[PDB]
Amino acid sequence: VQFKLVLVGDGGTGKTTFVKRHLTGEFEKKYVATLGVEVHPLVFHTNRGPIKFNVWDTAGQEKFGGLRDGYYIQAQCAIIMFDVTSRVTYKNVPNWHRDLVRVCENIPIVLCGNKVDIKDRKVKAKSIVFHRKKNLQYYDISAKSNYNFEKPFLWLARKLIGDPNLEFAA
Amino acid sequence: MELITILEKTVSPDRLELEAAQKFLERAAVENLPTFLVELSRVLANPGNSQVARVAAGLQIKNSLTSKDPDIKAQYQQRWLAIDANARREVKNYVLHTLGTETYRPSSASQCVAGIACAEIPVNQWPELIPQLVANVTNPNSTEHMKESTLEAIGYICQDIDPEQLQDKSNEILTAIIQGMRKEEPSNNVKLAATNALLNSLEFTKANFDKESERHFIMQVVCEATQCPDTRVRVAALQNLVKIMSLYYQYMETYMGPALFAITIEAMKSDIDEVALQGIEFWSNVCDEEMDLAIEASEAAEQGRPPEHTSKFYAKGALQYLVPILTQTLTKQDENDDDDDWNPCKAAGVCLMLLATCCEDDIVPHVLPFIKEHIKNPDWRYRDAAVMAFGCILEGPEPSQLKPLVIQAMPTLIELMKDPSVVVRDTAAWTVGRICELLPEAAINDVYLAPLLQCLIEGLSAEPRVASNVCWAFSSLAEAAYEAADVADDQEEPATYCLSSSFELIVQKLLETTDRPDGHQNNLRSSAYESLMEIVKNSAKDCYPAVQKTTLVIMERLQQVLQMESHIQSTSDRIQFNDLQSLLCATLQNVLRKVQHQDALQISDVVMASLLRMFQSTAGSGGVQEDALMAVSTLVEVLGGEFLKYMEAFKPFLGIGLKNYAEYQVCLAAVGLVGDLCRALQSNIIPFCDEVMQLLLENLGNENVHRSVKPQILSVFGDIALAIGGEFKKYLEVVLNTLQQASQAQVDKSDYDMVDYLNELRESCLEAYTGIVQGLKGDQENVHPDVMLVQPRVEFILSFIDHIAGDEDHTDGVVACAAGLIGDLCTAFGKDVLKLVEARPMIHELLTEGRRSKTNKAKTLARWATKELRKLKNQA
């Protein structure tokens, strides 16, 4: 049992870092630009058997976009990740949502405000109102301090399977 | 080979296969655009092709016809316009014939229609698309898929294109939308597509919305569509209502009264999660727009003008029906519910907080009887709803009114901290934390502070979800008591305060909370460390032996972390070891700023030994090398001039940190360490100054460097110059040349991302020049021969600050640093700086702006610069 996930956002807001943190564990510090796309499977164990997410790590830069919207074919779940420390990463969230809904019909989308371990936040939690508008799920996340680093996958597993009584029995 | 094979290859999750397909598509696009686009259009229009290939070809045409960057989008549009008209005509014919042949629920060819239309319509080279779409939608013989695809294409066109192109023929577009949305449509999918198309086109039809009859027709059709038996159509119609109220709030006064209120109240009362969530979000959006209009009206009243838009207070008038419905929905829960589940209960709580912030004291009497009725309800759901409402109404009302209520309810909150229900305990701890945040004087009350502290230190042993808000309440209460301290004192620290009677017990319980094996859950260990750092930062001097014992415990824990380098076995043990390193180093940074100099003198040797061991463990490139640098910086700030003993051993690690530059945070931390070392050591950093200046020169140009790194480098250029005085003349010319090259560069002023970057860069340039002039001028004597080397650079410095003052964005820091630089140049050169300043009239305007500026330091520096200019004017 596995699903297909698309991880979108602006240029290196934390997507590759979050994927690497969840995959192996090590927090990569250098900013390495993603060349087109990265396919990294993530494994989780629940109380109803293990699952797998194929996280399509898309590129947030226009030069290295590659196929761009062509990675959204037959997507089953979506995570829109943006840097809290940069406001323009949040301002492009409706564009990524628009590109998601024009290729995906009825796919649940989870917002993720990444890198909240920084003491000063340019995008406050009050101002994040896009998840309210499109009935989306929002989590405050951080790949460095492990703040809610398993919550979005938990919500996506609960939504796709249909069992709210599902817990990561790690 | 065949294009269909590559188009189907574009979806496989293989890296080499995807790269080969992407390279083939890129080469085909570069080699010959028109034949490639014709082949793509012929592939898309074929119904016999697979769905994946058709959508891939459609997205290929779209992303070869448009892009997110507006300049690249315009370039691609002009490139499409450069194509011969026959190939474009064939592509348009195939794309238009593709509509209605798609069994896919989202239309793929509609994106192609929008992308082609956004280029063709401003040239008016395709004057057949709108009549074709109108005749397709309005034809009763049209199929469901054809109507859906045409409506979706209409919505995409109206969203993507500029509104000043189809303004003349938008009436037929809205007629088609209304015809496709009405109740007589048999298929629900067509209604859903029509509502989504209207949702996209709501920003396009503003000129049509200005007309009264069309606005009335749209409102009537949307209100009719809100009553659809299908759930998704109701959700889409409610979203349309939300966007209408967001965009057209000035025209809802005629329609919200008799029509919208009952529909939205019935949506709120619905047991369906989506419809109730949409109604709650409708009223939350009403509150958001009303508070934005209130902010606008306040700003207009500060300017002595009427506001552009006047709110009519819909939520304030509808509070009487909003509050009981919200509180009734607040009773909907389950025994297994997360905090940020975003159910209608969480939405109702957020909407209650928004209503409180929007309506101030008008929400208190409508929600107090619910609390008084259900504060002792036998069912835990109603007590949970009562305490959640009491927590939510804290922010926004005047705290003087809330003080007797929270004083009365404080014993009940203490009892509910020991409630058998887990959710009631969680919400009670959340309410206590919000009490300590918003109304701090209620928490520090001599009647109930001791049972409150006992309940808090017992809740530190409770579940991690409780203990997170318990420690957050502890930190906020420590801040509140510290601000409530210093009764007379007139000192830098209070002698004693309210938590001094149990500070040792509190810090012991926090240290035991750190060692909880379940501290990984709900970020309990990080929250406990943050609470410990906040309470040791906000502590009095009578608790100092407890601070010293805590520092010794942290040092011993760091030494235990030192002794487990060979204990690294798995990845998800060494990453927790790295997290412990970061937390313990931040804890050391927080506790070392509070300890005395003499007491930290004995522990500084062991601290430096620990940091040197961690640097030896992280000698190769990076590893962490971030928290340890600021730990060394805090140790330097503690010690001062006695740090020079360890400088010889610290030289290679600082050299590695300066040579690395692959991480912006690590380089920034090393740069700040260099600045703090210069401040602490004065002229004792000269033997290392040549090496660190060579490293800074190597990292100066270095075009693959993050934007925030360079201003810090200029700031420590100024710091090094000010620290070493006249010894900077060895590299003064090269530093001045590179600073001139950096200051000559300028970025765009349109996007606001680089506005703060250019402000910080200019502030750092002025700081660097200020430090150079202050170093070369000496400290107490008259003008020096060292500043005569920078004498021809005064003209360029004043030209650069004239160019800065020409820009009108500004901040306080740039004007303050400019005034300091002007004063230093005046004191260093006399009448020449005054004459060159008088040559540029914008400098006086910038100084007047700085005197106008509310920052005390900036105004003081501007006044000092003006005084120096006046003294130079009166000199001769």
Ligand SMILES: Nc1nc2c(ncn2[C@@H]2O[C@H](COP(=O)(O)OP(=O)(O)OP(=O)(O)O)[C@@H](O)[C@H]2O)c(=O)[nH]1
């Ligand atoms: N404070 C903090 N910083 C983070 C965290 N995660 C990532 N960062 C920073 O953000 C950068 C992330 O880079 P990427 O994730 O690769 O950028 P991207 O969004 O994937 O886009 P690409 O450039 O295409 O790879 C890192 O270099 C880190 O410096 C975090 O959890 N906390």
Ligand SMILES: [Mg+2]
């Ligand atoms: Mg990336």
